[PDB]
Every structure is written in structure tokens, then in C-alpha cells.
Amino acid sequence: VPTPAEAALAAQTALAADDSPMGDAARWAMGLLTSSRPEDVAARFIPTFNFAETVREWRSKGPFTVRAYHPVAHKGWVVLSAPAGVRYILSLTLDSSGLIRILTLKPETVIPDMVTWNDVEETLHTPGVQHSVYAVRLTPDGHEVLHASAPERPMPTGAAYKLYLMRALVAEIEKGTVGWDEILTLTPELRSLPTGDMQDLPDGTRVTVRETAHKMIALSDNTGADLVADRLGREVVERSLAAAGHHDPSLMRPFLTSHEVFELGWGDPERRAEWVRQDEAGRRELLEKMAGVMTVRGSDLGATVHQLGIDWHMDAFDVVRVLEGLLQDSGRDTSGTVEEILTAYPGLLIDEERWRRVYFKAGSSPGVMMFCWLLQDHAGISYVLVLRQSADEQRLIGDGLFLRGIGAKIIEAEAKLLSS
Numbered sequence: 001v002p003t004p005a006e007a008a009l010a011a012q013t014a015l016a017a018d019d020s021p022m023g024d025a026a027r028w029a030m031g032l033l034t035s036s037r038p039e040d041v042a043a044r045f046i047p048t049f050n051f052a053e054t055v056r057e058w059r060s061k062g063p064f065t066v067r068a069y070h071p072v073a074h075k076g077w078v079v080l081s082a083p084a085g086v087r088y089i090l091s092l093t094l095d096s097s098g099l100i101r102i103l104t105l106k107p108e109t110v111i112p113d114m115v116t117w118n119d120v121e122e123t124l125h126t127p128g129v130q131h132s133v134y135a136v137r138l139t140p141d142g143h144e145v146l147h148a149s150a151p152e153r154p155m156p157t158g159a160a161y162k163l164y165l166m167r168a169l170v171a172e173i174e175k176g177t178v179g180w181d182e183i184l185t186l187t188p189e190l191r192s193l194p195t196g197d198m199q200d201l202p203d204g205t206r207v208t209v210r211e212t213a214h215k216m217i218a219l220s221d222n223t224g225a226d227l228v229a230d231r232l233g234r235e236v237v238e239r240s241l242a243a244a245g246h247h248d249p250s251l252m253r254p255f256l257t258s259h260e261v262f263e264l265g266w267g268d269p270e271r272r273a274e275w276v277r278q279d280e281a282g283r284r285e286l287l288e289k290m291a292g293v294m295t296v297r298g299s300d301l302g303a304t305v306h307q308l309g310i311d312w313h314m315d316a317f318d319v320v321r322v323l324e325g326l327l328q329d330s331g332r333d334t335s336g337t338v339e340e341i342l343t344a345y346p347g348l349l350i351d352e353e354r355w356r357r358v359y360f361k362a363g364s365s366p367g368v369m370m371f372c373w374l375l376q377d378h379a380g381i382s383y384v385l386v387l388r389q390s391a392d393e394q395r396l397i398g399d400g401l402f403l404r405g406i407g408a409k410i411i412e413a414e415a416k417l418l419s420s
């Protein structure tokens with residue numbers, strides 16, 4: 001088991017040797033912090049990306065020593081020690097060609113090693129935050145509950161809704177009303193905000209249903225999700241919540257697009273008061289009227305709106321059901337297309353000798369964080385873990401490394417917590 005000096009050395013060597021988009025970006029960002037030029041910056045970041053002042057302030061906190069390095073596809077984390085035992089984390093999020101979309105340097109997110117489920121509960125609890133943890137083993141005859149806190153509580157789940165969108169899509173593929181190689185087309189009206197990269201494509205860009213669905217899940221691409229929802233139609237997306245496991249489908253009807261959550265949640269306050277006042281008919285009518293090119297920008301987001309219904313609400317059982325349904329859908333798809341999409345991005349570095357397959361999905365919105373995994377071993381034993389937080393203030397939740405890291409520690413301690 002690596003001692004402190006061993007782990008920091010291994011992290012440092014791995015960062016230097018990491019021949020990948022994350023390795024390239026992580027090494028470059030570390031150089032900004034440890035060395036002594038607007039063109040080289042602009043070339044490292046997304047085209048639509050103050051920063052000089054940001055970097056100056058970062059550098060004032062050093063010198064930094066690399067203590068841990070956690071590359072995970074387009075997401076990365078570097079744990080740094082500064083003078084006097086003070087630790088920070090550098091977080092990277094990349095686009096599809098390895099340009100930096102998000103780069104932060106923040107106080108360290110501390111997650112202790114978990115021995116018991118009570119460790120989990122006591123670590124996670126935050127006054128003013130509602131949380132829920134649900135862990136099950138799936139069996140032919142129902143689910144064995146390993147741990148449960150508030151699974152029956154419906155909570156906002158952000159892009160976890162894209163699990164239902166995926167199931168709706170597979171349902172239509174099986175019916176032959178849509179094809180994996182059918183072409184979807186990006187239009188101004190169909191463009192949404194990040195998470196994702198597809199919004200950065202030119203108007204009129206032609207993309208397959210397959211690659212759109214891949215990015216919708218793997219990159220949580222909001223524009224990719226909105227492209228699929230547009231192609232399927234809202235009625236088809238909705239008329240599948242009942243089939244695909246949902247305790248109260250009325251909570252997601254109308255089943256909002258990401259464009260719609262963004263535009264309604266952070267646009268015109270009167271239009272938002274109209275939603276709150278309206279019944280299902282008036283809300284469908286409001287959304288039809290709102291249809292068009294977004295006016296809301298990422299800079300407008302902040303206040304929480306999930307408490308108004310402007311999010312996607314589900315209970316922990318619903319999340320287990322849709323993941324279990326996806327497992328089944330994947331198994332029926334002899335082409336492996338569904339499986340490849342579901343497994344591309346497991347959200348963590350996974351022990352592949354232990355786990356044959358891992359599905360993952362996150363959701364986040366102001367005041368909302370969630371992570372869920374389905375992990376199946378090589379004997380075919382499946383576990384699902386569902387972690388959720390909601391609050392009236394986004395600062396009580398933070399950037400989601402906490403909740404993800406809790407999952408990470410649970411999964412690390414699987415022989416204690418999951419498979420004991």
C-alpha cells in the first residue's frame with residue numbers, strides 16, 4: 001500500500017509520462033503554476049474562453065508539490081501541497097480535441113477512506129443540504145439493499161434524465177423508427193449550454209444518431225441530448241418514463257430539454273413566474289412559445305430553480321430502474337452500440353480486473369448534484385449506487401468533487417461496503 005512519499009512520487013512520474021490529451025493539458029497547467037503570454041493561453045483553451053490575474057493569484061499560493069494525479073478521460077484532478085501543509089486541487093475539464101474548457105484551483109476536497117456506511121453518512125451530511133445514498137445488489141428476484149438514506153425522496157438529478165432519453169432512443173431503434181447512422185443536423189435553435197462540446201460545432205453540422213448519443217452520455221453533452229430529444233419528440237421521450245421505471249411521471253411532464261431548463265430557469269423572471277402558476281397545459285404552451293435560439297448564457301446561471309420543477313426529479317429507486325433497464329437494453333443489442341456508449345466514461349479510474357462493466361452518469365444544476373454507477377463483476381453480479389444532494393444555495397454543494405469522491409471511496413471499499 002503506497003506510503004505518502006511513494007504515492008506523491010508515483011503521481012509525479014505518471015503526470016510526466018501521461019501521453020494523452022489530459023496529460024498534455026495537466027502538464028501545461030502545472031507549468032503555469034510553477035514557472036515564471038496571451039497567444040499560448042488562447043491556443044490551449046476552447047475558442048470561446050482576467051485569466052492573467054487569475055494565474056497571478058494562483059501562483060501566489062505556491063510553491064506547489066504534486067501529491068496525487070487523477071486523470072479520467074476528459075476530466076482530471078491534480079492534488080497539490082502548498083507551504084505549511086495547505087492543499088489544493090487543480091481541476092481540468094477538456095473538450096473533444098483536448099482544449100481546456102474549465103480550469104480551477106480550489107481548496108482541497110477532503111474525503112476520508114470509508115470503513116462503514118455510517119462513515120459515508122457522517123462525512124456527507126451538510127446542514128442545509130438534503131442528501132440520499134442508495135446501494136443495492138441486483139438479483140433475479142429483486143434488489144438486496146446494502147444501504148439506504150432517503151431513497152424514497154424525489155430529488156432533482158440534472159443530466160441523470162439523459163438515462164431516460166437513452167432508453168427512449170433505444171426503444172425507437174428497436175422499433176426501427178430511428179437508425180444509429182441517421183443524420184441529425186445542428187441548428188441555431190438546437191444549440192444548448194455546456195456540459196458538452198457539440199454547441200461548438202457550426203450551424204448545419206451533420207452528425208449521426210450514434211455519435212450524438214455517445215456524446216450525450218459520455219460527455220453529458222446537453223446539445224447532443226437536445227438533438228436526440230428533438231428527433232424523438234417530447235411525447236415519445238415522455239411516453240417512455242412509465243416503461244423505463246418512474247414513481248411519478250407527472251414530475252417530468254413536460255419532460256424539459258436542457259435548453260429549456262437553462263432558458264426558463266435563468267431567463268425572463270415573468271416567464272418563470274408563469275411556469276410556476278401554470279398547469280400542464282399552460283406549461284406546454286409556455287414552452288412552445290419559448291422555442292427559439294437561447295438568450296441565456298452560462299454567466300446568468302446561479303440562483304436555484306429546481307424547487308420550481310425546472311430540473312428532472314426522481315427517487316433513488318427510479319435511478320436503479322433506468323440503469324437496470326439500460327443493462328437489459330444493452331444485452332439485447334447484439335451490435336454492441338448501446339454498450340459502447342454506456343461504458344465509454346465510467347467517471348472514475350475503475351479496477352477492470354474486478355468490474356467487467358460500469359455504467360456511470362452525473363447530473364448537476366445550481367443547488368443539485370448527483371452521481372450514479374452500475375458496476376457488474378465478471379461473474380455477472382451487478383451493484384447500483386445512487387448519490388444525490390440538493391440545496392437552496394449552490395455554495396453548500398460546490399463543484400461535485402465531494403460527492404464523486406465519496407462514490408470513489410465506496411467503490412474502492414467495495415469488498416467492505418458492496419460485496420461483503
Ligand SMILES: O=C(O)[C@H]1/C(=C/CO)O[C@@H]2CC(=O)N21
Nearest residue numbers: 159195220362363364399400
Ligand atoms: O459528467 C461529469 O462527470 C460532470 C457532470 C455532468 C453533468 O452535467 O456533473 C458532475 C460535476 C462534474 O464535473 N461532473
Ligand SMILES: O=C(O)[C@H]1/C(=C/CO)O[C@@H]2CC(=O)N21
Nearest residue numbers: 070077079109348404405408
Ligand atoms: O480517488 C479518489 O479518492 C477520488 C479523488 C479525490 C481527490 O483527492 O479524485 C478522484 C476523482 C475521484 O472521485 N477520485
